[PDB]
Design a protein around this ligand. Structure first.
Ligand code: HEM
Ligand code: HEM
Ligand code: HEM
Ligand code: HEM
Ligand SMILES: [Cl-]
Ligand SMILES: [Cl-]
Lengths: 99, 99
């Protein structure tokens, strides 16, 4: 599997607004083929960016979602972001250990 | 829950040695109270550091592990580190969505 993290820069005080924009977003991705899950991570120490951490069975599965269903999920939405920058961090899972 | 990511810097070519070291490390953290799991992420694009992504029911559970077992787990090892630096990134899980 692969991990794709969108590391989002958020202006001071805009944390709650950004989090609210994610609150009903599950429908936009949860059903996608090869999707294994995602977490929105609020930074607490050592990082100022929010991490949107997504897990996929493959790179192609993420790309299919990004190029199709993800774009479609914007219909009817303002495209005015509160984030001031974003960086995509891509990784391959080399080890996974359960609780 | 909380997420603690250790972002470790690894010289070129040490990736395999670092990964081999993590391959036999599950025992050092699994079963610890409040531990929910971890992944070793090998960087592919956008990042040069390995991400050690760990999940915990609370910060206290993470501190209890880091302060006791994790230290104890070094006893008997005679290898020098291959990592040259590390940064702990700490997060609160705000949203969790399963696939
Ligand atoms: C992991 C791959 C992803 C990438 C590359 C990506 C990419 C982006 C980019 C480039 C932006 C614009 C941010 C800016 O203006 O600086 C954005 C915003 C956004 N994305 Fe993601 N995204 C990803 C995953 C997700 C997922 C899984 C969700 C939710 C299901 C999501 C929901 C959002 C939302 C709600 C915004 C609006 C942020 C705002 O208004 O400031 N994204 N994304
Ligand atoms: C320049 C590029 C982008 C911009 C400016 C942008 C902007 C936004 C904004 C402002 C929203 C908020 C909608 C609202 O508040 O109602 C949103 C939602 C979202 N974005 Fe984007 N985004 C971009 C690219 C991306 C990409 C590349 C991805 C994933 C690969 C993504 C995934 C999402 C998702 C899943 C949502 C939530 C849709 C929903 O609430 O139903 N976005 N985006
Ligand atoms: C400067 C500080 C540290 C140094 C120089 C260091 C060095 C090392 C080295 C060389 C190993 C090799 C084990 C092997 O090759 O088999 C190791 C293992 C390990 N380290 Fe550290 N470490 C440090 C701090 C930490 C911290 C702060 C944690 C967690 C809170 C940690 C957790 C671990 C764990 C869980 C193992 C694996 C134990 C095992 O597989 O038996 N280390 N460390
Ligand atoms: C998330 C909290 C963690 C922290 C704060 C932490 C911290 C550290 C630090 C400071 C080092 C020394 C890096 C250096 O010498 O530059 C290290 C090395 C290491 N840690 Fe972690 N660690 C964490 C989690 C873990 C876990 C869960 C494992 C495995 C179960 C692990 C296994 C190791 C190993 C094998 C090394 C040696 C890397 C090498 O060979 O150079 N650590 N850790
Ligand atoms: Cl995002
Ligand atoms: Cl580590």
């Amino acid at each position: 599997p692969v991990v794709k993290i969108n590391a989002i820069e958020v202006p001071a005080g805009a944390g709650p607004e950004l989090e609210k924009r994610f609150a009903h977003s599950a429908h936009a991705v949860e059903n996608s083929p090869g999707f294994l899950g995602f977490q929105l991570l609020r930074p607490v120490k050592g990082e100022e960016r929010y991490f949107v951490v997504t897990h996929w069975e493959s790179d192609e599965a993420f790309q299919a979602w990004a190029n199709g269903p993800a774009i479609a999920a914007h219909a009817g939405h303002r495209a005015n972001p509160v984030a001031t920058g974003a960086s995509l961090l891509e990784f391959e899972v080399v080890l996974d250990v359960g609780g």
